[PDB]
Paper text:
Although it has a typical pilin size—17 kDa for the processed protein—[name] is an unusual pilin. To better understand the role of [name], we solved its 3D structure by X-ray crystallography. After optimizing the best diffracting crystals and using protein produced in the presence of seleno-methionine (SeMet) for phase determination, we solved a 1.77-Å resolution structure. As can be seen in Fig. 2A, [name]—which looks like an “ice axe”—exhibits a typical pilin architecture, with an N-terminal α1-helix packed against a β-sheet composed of five antiparallel β-strands. Strikingly, while [name] exhibits no sequence homology to other pilins, our structure reveals extensive structural similarity to the I subunit of HIJK tip-located complex of conserved minor pilins in a variety of T4F. The PilAC interaction interface involves the α1 and α2 helices and the first 2 β-strands (β1 and β2) of [name]. [name] thus acts as an intrapilus chaperone, protecting PilC from proteolysis by perhaps participating in its folding.
Type 4 pili (T4P)—important in bacterial pathogens—are filaments composed of one well-characterized major pilin, and several minor pilins whose roles are often poorly understood. Streptococcus sanguinis T4P are composed of five pilins, which makes it a good model to determine the role of each pilin subunit in detail.
Numbering used by the authors:
A (entry chain B): 12 to 139
B (entry chain C): 11 to 139
């Protein structure tokens, strides 16, 4: 409401969006009942396919404090190449600012083969 | 952290700490100390009302329970070609190193002295100085 509160809301949204990215990273990496996650299994199949699905994998999460992150993962091959070493996966995590439809969006891209970060960005965005 | 999985976690943690640093700096700017404006507020209030204000950075740090550190720098400047407090914008820079590295996450938020409205915001992973 106030500009003072708007600042705090922007910061909380940045924090929640980042928490969503961490949640996604864990969902990707952490085994479930001793075997890869369904999300990892999907990207493993895509990474080893010469014409992979590019359908986003979408989820939403409510944290303990009631803040919400809307999360999407997707991948694409470097243009003109195939193979897992040329497959890069992007996590997008969005969280709306309280009392607003503006949102903070965190976008991190990592390589399937190395798990190294290729790019990272984060921005306050106006409402869709 | 040297594995790439840990590096990603360390990047996220440095982003958390930098963001929390900005939040604490905001509170330090705004919150009264003994019924009187904070010392950092009084300094920018003086600057905002000067035709040639000091552009000296004001430095602080915040150490968190997990042991991470945010280094804070605040400063201000008048909009080029303009004067007065309505045209005085203050920038908070908040840095935190990634664990096991001198690479860092830097959060930079600029707000207007008069309105307290956000004028710009950015954040980046940075290579070591
Ligand atoms: Cl790894």
């Amino acid at each position: 409401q106030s500009q003072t509160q708007r600042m705090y809301n922007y910061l909380k949204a940045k924090y929640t969006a980042t928490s969503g990215t961490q949640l996604a990273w864990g969902a990707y990496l952490d085994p479930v009942d001793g075997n890869p996650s369904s999300v990892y299994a999907e990207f493993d199949e895509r990474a080893h396919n010469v014409d992979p699905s590019t359908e986003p994998i979408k989820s939403t999460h409510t944290f303990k404090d009631g803040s919400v992150a809307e999360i999407e993962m997707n991948g694409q091959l470097v243009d003109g190449l195939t193979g897992p070493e040329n497959y890069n996966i992007t996590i997008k995590s969005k969280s709306k600012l309280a009392g607003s439809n503006d949102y903070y969006e965190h976008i991190v891209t990592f390589n399937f083969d190395t798990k190294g970060i290729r790019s990272e960005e984060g921005h306050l965005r106006s409402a869709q």
